[PDB]
Amino acid sequence: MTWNFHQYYTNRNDGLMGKLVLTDEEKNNLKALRKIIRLRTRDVFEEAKGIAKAVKKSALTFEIIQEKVSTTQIKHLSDSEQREVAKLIYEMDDDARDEFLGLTPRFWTQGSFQYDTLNRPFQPGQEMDIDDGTYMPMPIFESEPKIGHSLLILLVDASLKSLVAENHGWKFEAKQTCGRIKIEAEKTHIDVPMYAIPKDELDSENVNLALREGDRKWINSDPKIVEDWFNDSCIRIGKHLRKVCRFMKAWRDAQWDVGGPSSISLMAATVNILDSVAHDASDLGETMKIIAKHLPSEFARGVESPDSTDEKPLFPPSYKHGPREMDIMSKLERLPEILSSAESADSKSEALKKINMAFGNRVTNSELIVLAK
Ligand SMILES: CN1c2c([nH]c(N)nc2=O)NC[C@@H]1CNc1ccc(C(=O)N[C@@H](CCC(=O)N[C@@H](CCC(=O)O)C(=O)O)C(=O)O)cc1
Ligand SMILES: [Mg+2]
């Protein structure tokens, strides 16, 4: 009794991959959602820039500026927020207004869904986490850019909130790093962080994330850093990297209804292990056992972000562990034992049941599990 699980994992119909990967349709529906947001955000900025251009032509009273604001999509903000938008437009200097009039919101063409490892949600209440940033090409700024933090966030909020008003089942929720649209019926939420970038390329640093609460209004955070890291890793290691990342993310979804380690911490740890430990990429069952064996050590040490400019660990080191991190360490230690137990189970039926204690009950096809060669 030594069971092989390579097809349990990799089978694109009945295997774990077949249960995790979104259909071409479901993917296109997320793309459609994403497109609706981007269009509305662009539309809102035009409406606002429309008012700004009228002010450049003639400096209107605040009352007239406010009336114009009130009949834009910005009408979906509160009264005080509309006043604030109208006041910011009223207060613009010539230099600032010309900047604003040249600003159109930008979106990332290279962005995939979770580095192309977005899994179908497993447990009831679990939702797909989709991020689509809005990039604001502006002059490089020291503290604050000509176009203010406040105005930009208000306009993005107006965009998201105006969509929420026109679409039943949608809700808005403001977060630290982003505005969020939650669509519970579609088990989906999409986060719209807002970044400031240089007008002329020059993209290394000076990607600035807008923070909604607190003293710092902007922080340096370039999502391209982690994206490049991971894409390069997949090239260096092989096509199985994304698969094993999907599997660990699925394991996480199965072990915790809410909570568990971040997907990125699992990706960083998995990459570290596959770079440093011999494995056979032709057997994902053997490969997963190798990953399972080494994860506890990766997490115990704390998981460093692949972005060297991020001082905060993706997962805390052992000495900073509370009940939640202790819980996570505990399940990580169980994982390699679960995989070995499945491997030596009495039957196909039992082997499936045991491995499904790691990844949840999804795969129903025991025939994917085969007697070892
Ligand atoms: C890559 N980048 C980069 C960054 N950082 C670093 N460190 N290195 C980098 O290389 N960050 C940002 C930078 C972004 N590059 C971009 C360049 C252009 C665009 C862009 O979306 N342009 C259009 C969008 C409108 C549209 O197409 N509308 C469509 C539909 C819009 C839709 O839904 O998609 C229409 O006509 O209807 C525009 O100019 O308005 C988006 C991103
Ligand atoms: Mg998100």
Side-chain angles (χ1 to χ4, degrees):
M1 294 171 188
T2 309
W3 300 112
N4 177 280
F5 295 86
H6 174 83
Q7 305 181 53
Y8 165 87
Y9 283 108
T10 67
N11 188 284
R12 307 184 211 273
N13 300 121
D14 283 31
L16 197 43
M17 286 296 291
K19 300 293 179 169
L20 298 184
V21 175
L22 277 55
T23 65
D24 275 345
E25 190 218 34
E26 296 160 321
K27 266 191 54 79
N28 290 329
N29 306 130
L30 291 180
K31 283 179 182 299
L33 167 65
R34 195 172 58 174
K35 189 136 179 298
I36 292 181
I37 303 287
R38 294 172 176 180
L39 288 193
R40 179 54 55 87
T41 296
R42 177 204 67 182
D43 287 10
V44 167
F45 270 73
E46 290 307 315
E47 296 177 349
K49 291 157 62 179
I51 298 179
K53 183 190 180 312
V55 171
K56 180 178 165 77
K57 176 183 180 183
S58 184
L60 311 183
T61 61
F62 172 78
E63 183 180 54
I64 299 286
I65 297 182
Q66 219 188 6
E67 186 76 323
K68 292 180 173 289
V69 164
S70 77
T71 60
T72 64
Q73 296 288 21
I74 305 164
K75 62 180 168 177
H76 294 111
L77 298 188
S78 66
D79 289 338
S80 49
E81 293 180 314
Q82 293 179 59
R83 184 192 192 271
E84 195 177 353
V85 171
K87 180 174 178 177
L88 292 174
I89 292 178
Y90 173 85
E91 290 186 341
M92 280 193 196
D93 51 87
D94 294 319
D95 193 18
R97 186 190 306 105
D98 282 340
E99 276 294 1
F100 182 54
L101 291 174
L103 168 63
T104 89
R106 304 302 169 73
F107 311 95
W108 193 20
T109 56
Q110 280 258 287
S112 56
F113 294 132
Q114 292 180 9
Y115 315 98
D116 201 20
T117 65
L118 173 67
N119 291 330
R120 311 188 63 103
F122 177 40
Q123 306 191 49
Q126 293 187 329
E127 291 173 353
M128 298 185 279
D129 169 54
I130 303 305
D131 294 339
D132 193 39
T134 309
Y135 300 79
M136 304 299 179
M138 304 178 318
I140 273 196
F141 62 91
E142 190 111 22
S143 339
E144 183 80 347
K146 304 199 169 308
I147 320 91
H149 182 277
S150 297
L151 183 50
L152 297 177
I153 295 299
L154 281 168
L155 295 182
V156 174
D157 282 12
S159 167
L160 295 197
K161 283 183 173 177
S162 68
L163 286 174
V164 159
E166 302 169 358
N167 293 261
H168 295 103
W170 298 26
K171 298 202 306 188
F172 173 91
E173 178 187 342
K175 305 197 66 63
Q176 163 75 332
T177 75
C178 66
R180 169 173 290 180
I181 290 195
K182 187 182 289 293
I183 312 170
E184 200 191 291
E186 298 293 311
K187 315 164 95 51
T188 299
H189 66 252
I190 170 166
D191 298 324
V192 180
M194 203 213 61
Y195 299 97
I197 62 175
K199 203 167 69 178
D200 42 344
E201 281 191 346
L202 194 250
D203 31 27
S204 172
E205 233 202 7
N206 311 133
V207 183
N208 291 272
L209 165 65
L211 304 182
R212 295 165 165 262
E213 303 263 290
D215 282 41
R216 259 77 153 84
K217 295 160 88 66
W218 306 92
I219 46 178
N220 186 79
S221 174
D222 193 349
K224 184 171 192 299
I225 303 183
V226 164
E227 246 268 343
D228 288 341
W229 167 76
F230 187 72
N231 286 339
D232 292 344
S233 293
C234 298
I235 292 300
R236 177 198 324 124
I237 292 169
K239 288 202 70 84
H240 61 291
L241 175 56
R242 281 185 159 90
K243 291 181 179 61
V244 296
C245 286
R246 282 189 172 275
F247 301 152
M248 289 312 308
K249 294 173 57 176
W251 163 84
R252 185 266 325 275
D253 292 355
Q255 302 303 315
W256 296 276
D257 191 353
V258 167
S262 63
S263 303
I264 190 61
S265 66
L266 290 167
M267 291 163 60
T270 292
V271 168
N272 287 1
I273 290 164
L274 299 181
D275 275 337
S276 282
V277 174
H279 58 279
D280 167 29
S282 78
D283 190 340
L284 299 200
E286 178 263 16
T287 295
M288 281 301 298
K289 292 178 86 285
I290 286 176
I291 290 163
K293 176 168 162 58
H294 294 95
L295 286 173
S297 66
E298 282 296 318
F299 274 73
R301 285 204 317 272
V303 174
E304 177 187 327
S305 169
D307 187 347
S308 308
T309 76
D310 198 341
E311 322 191 48
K312 182 174 180 56
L314 303 181
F315 177 82
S318 284
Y319 51 85
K320 304 170 92 84
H321 283 189
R324 266 112 88 159
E325 293 83 18
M326 290 181 171
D327 178 43
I328 289 161
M329 287 310 299
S330 181
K331 314 297 196 222
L332 285 171
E333 286 157 10
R334 295 168 78 83
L335 181 52
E337 295 196 352
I338 294 172
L339 295 187
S340 82
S341 285
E343 179 173 88
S344 64
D346 289 331
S347 61
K348 284 189 201 300
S349 171
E350 211 65 5
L352 175 67
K353 182 201 191 192
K354 287 163 183 300
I355 196 166
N356 282 3
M357 293 178 59
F359 309 104
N361 290 321
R362 297 225 237 187
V363 176
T364 52
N365 191 6
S366 49
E367 289 300 314
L368 302 178
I369 303 173
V370 293
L371 263 177
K373 298 211 84 61

